[PDB]
Scaffold this active site. Structure first.
Site, short mmCIF file in Angstrom:
data_model
loop_
_atom_site.label_atom_id
_atom_site.label_comp_id
_atom_site.label_asym_id
_atom_site.label_seq_id
_atom_site.Cartn_x
_atom_site.Cartn_y
_atom_site.Cartn_z
N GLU A 182 36.75 35.48 48.41
CA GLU A 182 37.59 34.99 48.41
C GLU A 182 37.73 33.17 48.71
O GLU A 182 38.56 32.81 47.98
CB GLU A 182 39.16 35.92 48.86
CG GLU A 182 38.79 36.75 48.77
CD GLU A 182 39.53 37.59 47.70
OE1 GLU A 182 39.53 38.86 46.83
OE2 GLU A 182 40.16 36.99 46.13
N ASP A 200 44.37 31.78 40.86
CA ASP A 200 43.47 32.90 40.91
C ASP A 200 42.64 33.56 39.83
O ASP A 200 42.96 32.30 38.49
CB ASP A 200 44.23 34.01 41.50
CG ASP A 200 44.73 35.35 41.05
OD1 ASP A 200 44.90 35.39 39.67
OD2 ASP A 200 45.09 35.87 41.69
#
Ligand SMILES: [Cl-]
Ligand SMILES: [Cl-]
Length: 162
Positions: A11, A20
């Site tokens: 991440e 994202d």
């Protein structure tokens, strides 16, 4: 290596609101703020999660706190889910981390939908599971991360992360 280090790799860490892979507002270590399109709504969500007026910026400690909570939640989600629990219970420690990774990324519901893969994993049919997992939107959209996770299910070791 452990689940935290694993996810920190997958991440990354951003202290400012960002978008994202799906274009959703997120912050820290993969902490999804909202699927809504407004930056305002995201800021609101942020302030509420942190407990202060952030102005879209958080500290590393704050990011880490959100992260621990998120990991905890994923685990608990797994444990509460009838479809997931049995799989998780049947796996060794390294593979459990892999499953947690998936849940963190796509949610309980999302992964519980991988019926066939789940069954193969439960049966310890590693290679077969690996091929089935790859036949997914997930693999096609985030291929590098998917390979890492898939390889981890396939081998039971951390090499894909070393
Ligand atoms: Cl929260
Ligand atoms: Cl990727």
């Amino acid at each position: 290596m452990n689940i935290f280090e694993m996810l920190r790799i997958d991440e990354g860490l951003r202290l400012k609101i960002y978008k994202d892979t799906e274009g959703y507002y997120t912050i820290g270590i993969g902490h999804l703020l909202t699927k809504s399109p407004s930056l305002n709504a995201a800021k609101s969500e942020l302030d509420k999660a942190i407990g202060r007026n952030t102005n879209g910026v958080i500290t590393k400690d704050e990011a880490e706190k959100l992260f621990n909570q998120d990991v905890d939640a994923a685990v608990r989600g797994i444990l509460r889910n009838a479809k997931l629990k049995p799989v998780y219970d049947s796996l060794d420690a390294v593979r459990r981390a892999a499953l947690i990774n998936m849940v963190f990324q796509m949610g309980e519901t999302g992964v519980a939908g991988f019926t066939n893969s789940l069954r193969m994993l439960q049966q310890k049919r590693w290679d077969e599971a690996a091929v089935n997992l790859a036949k997914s939107r997930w693999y096609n959209q985030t291929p590098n991360r998917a390979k890492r996770v898939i390889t981890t299910f396939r081998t039971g070791i951390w090499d894909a992360y070393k």
